[PDB]
Amino acid sequence: XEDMTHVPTDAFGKLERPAAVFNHDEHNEKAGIESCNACHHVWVNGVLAEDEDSVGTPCSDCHALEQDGDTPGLQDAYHQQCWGCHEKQAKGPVMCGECHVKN
Numbered sequence: 001x002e003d004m005t006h007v008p009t010d011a012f013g014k015l016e017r018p019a020a021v022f023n024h025d026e027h028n029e030k031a032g033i034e035s036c037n038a039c040h041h042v043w044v045n046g047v048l049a050e051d052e053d054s055v056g057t058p059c060s061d062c063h064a065l066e067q068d069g070d071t072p073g074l075q076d077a078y079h080q081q082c083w084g085c086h087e088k089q090a091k092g093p094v095m096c097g098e099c100h101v102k103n
Ligand code: HEM
Pocket: 001, 007, 008, 024, 028, 033, 034, 035, 036, 037, 038, 039, 040, 055, 056, 057, 058, 059, 060
């Protein structure tokens, strides 16, 4: 994903919002994220593997559009991951129009 400049949107069908800006490799370098499983996680039987990751599997392979149990639907997965870290670190966009950029 070194060519990535927005988050993939094909799983959603018709969009309400602009694609979310996300230059994956530059993002992750500026943010200081050193583990891939900060996002590409592996959750098994309610427990998060600390030493594994799911790189190479789309989020949308596990996260349906609808919530399943405590597995978030796909929109909420992205909002909880992305907007959740920004809020926890007090850095990064936290308005709709700073990710979903109209341009
Ligand atoms: C850690 C260094 C890391 C790697 C390696 C990695 C790889 C990776 C690949 C190969 C893809 C698929 C790209 C494609 O389809 O061409 C991908 C996709 C996404 N990633 Fe990633 N990624 C690493 C780390 C991070 C981190 C720390 C985050 C969150 C900040 C992140 C997130 C994403 C997202 C979102 C995508 C798109 C998912 C999809 O549905 O295809 N990755 N990454």
